[PDB]
Amino acid sequence: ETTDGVYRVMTRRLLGSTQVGVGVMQEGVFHTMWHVTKGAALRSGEGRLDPYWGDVKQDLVSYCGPWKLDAAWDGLSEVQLLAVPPGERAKNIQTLPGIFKTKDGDIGAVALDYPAGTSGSPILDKCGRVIGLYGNGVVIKNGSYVSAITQGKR
Amino acid sequence: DMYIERAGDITWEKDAEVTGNSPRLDVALDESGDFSLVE
Numbered sequence A: 001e002t003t004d005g006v007y008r009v010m011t012r013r014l015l016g017s018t019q020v021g022v023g024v025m026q027e028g029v030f031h032t033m034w035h036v037t038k039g040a041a042l043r044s045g046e047g048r049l050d051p052y053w054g055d056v057k058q059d060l061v062s063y064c065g066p067w068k069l070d071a072a073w074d075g076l077s078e079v080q081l082l083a084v085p086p087g088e089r090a091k092n093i094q095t096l097p098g099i100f101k102t103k104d105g106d107i108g109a110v111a112l113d114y115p116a117g118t119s120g121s122p123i124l125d126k127c128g129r130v131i132g133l134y135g136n137g138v139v140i141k142n143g144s145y146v147s148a149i150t151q152g153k154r
Numbered sequence B: 001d002m003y004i005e006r007a008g009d010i011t012w013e014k015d016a017e018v019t020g021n022s023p024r025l026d027v028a029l030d031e032s033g034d035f036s037l038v039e
């Protein structure tokens, strides 16, 4: 399957079939977070997807081609996390991002908590463009989880 | 062995559930790709 859209990433190496993450198929390239696959090859029916680019520090990886997602959060508007939780239907959650302030600049962040196997779920703007992937973040004072809006470079 | 399964289209949903706060946090990103809170 090469149809554009959001996909679950599954494994049969553990008990039963386990969802280890999520990813985005766009322009013939599969995009996910590095910690989901660890850079391993993936299967799509009879087809094989080989890693093309990856970076542990950005925590991103692309398959079949270079990273294609280049839209960015505008810093003002609400966005939607298209959450694909393990065993559950894809669901859109609208939110106003917070900010991660770092020594190298600011990044948007979403304060939404889902099972770890939801990592790789896309965050979208009002045009339906993917502005980043959910799943690399921190646990704050409250004990709640906050994910960076992680985007690659096209 | 890992495999992918389609889960949906990527579209904005009008009248989606609205939730989550917007915290401003000072953070650090290490060479292993881990974020940590700076205080």
Ligand SMILES: O=C1Nc2ccccc2C[C@@]12CCCN2
Pocket (backbone or CB within 6 Å): A113, A114, A115, A116, A117, A118, A119, A134, A135, A136, A139, A145
């Ligand atoms: O601390 C966590 N890490 C995590 C890692 C990737 C994606 C989503 C999450 C949320 C989670 C798992 C369940 C409780 N909070």
Ligand SMILES: O=C1Nc2ccccc2C[C@]12CCCN2
Pocket (backbone or CB within 6 Å): A085, A113, A114, A115
């Ligand atoms: O906040 C959550 N949302 C959620 C959504 C779908 C399935 C399971 C969960 C549990 C929880 C709490 C700790 C792990 N994530």
